[PDB]
Every structure is written in structure tokens, then in C-alpha cells.
């Protein structure tokens, strides 16, 4: 579910990714926290691809 969420974040569908995580995780606060840690993981992937 979080691989598909990071796919939606690479496409940058943030509202769809947040609704996807809040359906398949539970509360909206947990959805926000997991969305921002997946965005952090994806930024670290972009830095790894950069340098």
C-alpha cells in the first residue's frame, strides 16, 4: 500500500495519496504522518539518484 502511495507521490497526486492512505491506514493524522514520511523517503531517493 505504501509502494502504491509512493507511486502516487511520484506522480504528485497528493490528495489522492492522502485519501488512499487514510482509507488503508485509518485516521487522518496517521495518514498525514505516513504521507510526509513517504515524501521524505522519496526525497532521499531523489538525492540518492542525484549524487
Amino acid at each position: 500500500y505504501e509502494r502504491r502511495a509512493m507511486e502516487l507521490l511520484k506522480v504528485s497526486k497528493d490528495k489522492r495519496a492522502l485519501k488512499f492512505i487514510k482509507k488503508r491506514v485509518g485516521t487522518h493524522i496517521r495518514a498525514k504522518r505516513k504521507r510526509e514520511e513517504l515524501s521524505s523517503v522519496l526525497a532521499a531517493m531523489r538525492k540518492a539518484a542525484a549524487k
Binding site: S12, D14, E36, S39, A43, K47, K51
Partner: protein, 206 residues
């Protein structure tokens, strides 16, 4: 974003100067790409930042002073502009738009904006160019230095931004402090936080 990434980015460019070793004035530049801000909708952003860095400093100023301005502005070697010169180039308006081509940003005193809106103010605001006010402190020492680099984060219909900060030989800590305050006020001027920007990229003019 964290801090060590921009530390390593500025370190990488300050030792990667040897990629070019320019024939020009050596300086870097901030550029911003962001993800889904719609252009046709309202609540666009148009915000000046106050910056005590002056990171570019090669900058050309023209001030428009009232009384108590003349020989002191000419002794700090800033051109005094007068009502006779405003009517001199208000009889035809076209040469001061090339003065927006020579000079970037002006400065004004406090009374002249009844003389200005006759024809030439709305005629020559068509460059992004209106001269900046002073206050009743009546000082030009360092007030011109901080009213330059009041950086306009201006919204356009295009989804891209570029910020004019940084040269190669200022101090490292003051430069990372500069772009620290730059990117945090830019995120705070955006409609939402760090998700709203798609890329932070710091690389240089060449």
C-alpha cells in the same frame, strides 16, 4: 528540507567553481519549481522579503529626494532626482523606461506620489518598476542597503520561480543563513508547506 543537504550543495559548488572559473561576475542563483499551484484562481502571492544580506551587491540605484537630500546623496554618490528632472522626462516618457533598463530598482521620498500619478506613474509601472519609499527616520545610510534586496516573491501564470541570492565569496554561514530565511519565508508565503514545492535546487549562474 534539512540543513546538511544545502550545506553539502554549497560546499560542492564552492569547490566545483573550477568547472568554469568564469569570465563574468561570479555568483550563484536559487531556482524554485513547484507542483500544482493553479494560475487562473485567486489568492496569488506577491510578497517582499526583508534581507540584511545584500548577496549580489553589484547593484545600481537612483533615488528621488525632497529637500534635505541633495549634496548628501551626491556625497554618497547616489544621483539626486528632482521635480525639474521629473518634468524634463515627463514631457516625453520613453527614456526612463530605458532607465529601468539601466537601473533595476529605484528609491523615492515621501511627497512625490501626487506628481507621479499624472501620466508617468501608470505609464512606467509597466516594467515591474515603482520607486521605493523612505520613512521619517530620514537616513539613507544602510536604509538603501536593506531596501535593496527586499526580494519580490511574485506569482506568475507559469509554475516556476527563480530567486536572486548568493555569490561565491561571501561567508558560508551567512549564505546558508540567507537561503535559510529565503526558503522558510517562501514556504510560509506559499499556500501550504513543503509538499507545495516539487524541487529545491541551488546551482549557479553557469
Amino acid at each position: 528540507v534539512s540543513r546538511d543537504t544545502l550545506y553539502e550543495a554549497v560546499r560542492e559548488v564552492l569547490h566545483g567553481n573550477q568547472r568554469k572559473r568564469r569570465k563574468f561576475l561570479e555568483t550563484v542563483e536559487l531556482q524554485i519549481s513547484l507542483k500544482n499551484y493553479d494560475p487562473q484562481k485567486d489568492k496569488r502571492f506577491s510578497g517582499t522579503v526583508r534581507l540584511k544580506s545584500t548577496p549580489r551587491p553589484k547593484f545600481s540605484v537612483c533615488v528621488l529626494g525632497d529637500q534635505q537630500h541633495c549634496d548628501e546623496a551626491k556625497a554618497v554618490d547616489i544621483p539626486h532626482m528632482d521635480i525639474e528632472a521629473l518634468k524634463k522626462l515627463n514631457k516625453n516618457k520613453k527614456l526612463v523606461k530605458k532607465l529601468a533598463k539601466k537601473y533595476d530598482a529605484f528609491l523615492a521620498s515621501e511627497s512625490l506620489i501626487k506628481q507621479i500619478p499624472r501620466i508617468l506613474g501608470p505609464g512606467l509601472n509597466k516594467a515591474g518598476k515603482f520607486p521605493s519609499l523612505l520613512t521619517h527616520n530620514e537616513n539613507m545610510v544602510a536604509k538603501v542597503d536593506e531596501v535593496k534586496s527586499t526580494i519580490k516573491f511574485q506569482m506568475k501564470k507559469v509554475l516556476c520561480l527563480a530567486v536572486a541570492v548568493g555569490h561565491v565569496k561571501m561567508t558560508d554561514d551567512e549564505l546558508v543563513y540567507n537561503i535559510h530565511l529565503a526558503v522558510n519565508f517562501l514556504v510560509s508565503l506559499l499556500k501550504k508547506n513543503w509538499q507545495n514545492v516539487r524541487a529545491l535546487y541551488i546551482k549557479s549562474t553557469m
